[PDB]
């Protein structure tokens, strides 16, 4: 376990230096002694100790959230592709409804999505086969009634 160092560390960094901590006013000059302590110390673990000092194993994960061509997720199975009809779709965790049709927009090889003014999705790339598709909202409108006196 580390004990002494001049100042804290930025996140996601490591340091295994063996320089002597200059606690005292005298210049240690790389010599261990009084007020010149060794940076590391050791813990102890005995089976009869209390739970307050028993050892614990800890693991930390980290994510990236669909900002690139994805590579890892669950065992959900695919299906055949249908177009020119009003359909519900799910591409890599991006869900939506609408109509898919063949397009002709040209992308750079590393690109994966297409947006617009309203930050909504407009063009996607099928991860199964390299070709480009776009989304169009399904038809809708308003209705009115004309009538004479009841």
């Amino acid at each position: 376990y580390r004990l002494f160092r001049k100042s804290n560390l930025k996140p996601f960094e490591r340091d295994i230096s063996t320089e002597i901590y200059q606690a005292g006013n005298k210049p240690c000059n790389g010599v261990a002694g009084f007020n010149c302590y060794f940076p590391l110390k050791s813990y102890s673990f005995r089976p009869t100790y209390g739970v307050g000092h028993q050892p614990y194993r800890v693991v930390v994960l980290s994510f990236e959230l669909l900002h690139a061509p994805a590579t890892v997720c669950g065992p959900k199975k695919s299906t055949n592709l249908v177009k020119n009809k009003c359909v519900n779709f799910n591409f890599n965790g991006l869900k939506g409804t609408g109509v898919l049709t063949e397009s002709n927009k040209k992308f750079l090889p590393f690109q994966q999505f297409g947006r617009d003014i309203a930050d909504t999705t407009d063009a996607v790339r099928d991860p199964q086969t390299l070709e480009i598709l776009d989304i169009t909202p399904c038809s809708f409108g308003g209705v009115s009634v004309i009538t004479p006196g009841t």
């Binding site: 930390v60 695919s78 799910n90 809708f140 009634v145 009538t147």
Partner: protein, 99 residues
Amino acid sequence: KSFTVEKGIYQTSNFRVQPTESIVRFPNITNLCPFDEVFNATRFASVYAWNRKRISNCVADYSVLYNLAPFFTFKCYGVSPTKLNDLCFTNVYADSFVI
């Protein structure tokens, strides 16, 4: 909001067409994912030299983690742990140590 309507024109609501089918698409990677190598490994590293591992190109299954003994701490920030199986990820980094 009445029983009588006068002569004229009125506007009531709107109409939208409904879908009829469901479509999903995922990459066709079918390699078992190596979570085994880290969770139930034998000896872990030291805190001052903490060890990390990179995981990519695999199919995950986060339910198997429940096979262990009653945990002391199991928490998440930013994602509800229940639906982890319904999201796709790009790269995975896993750090381990003992405290």
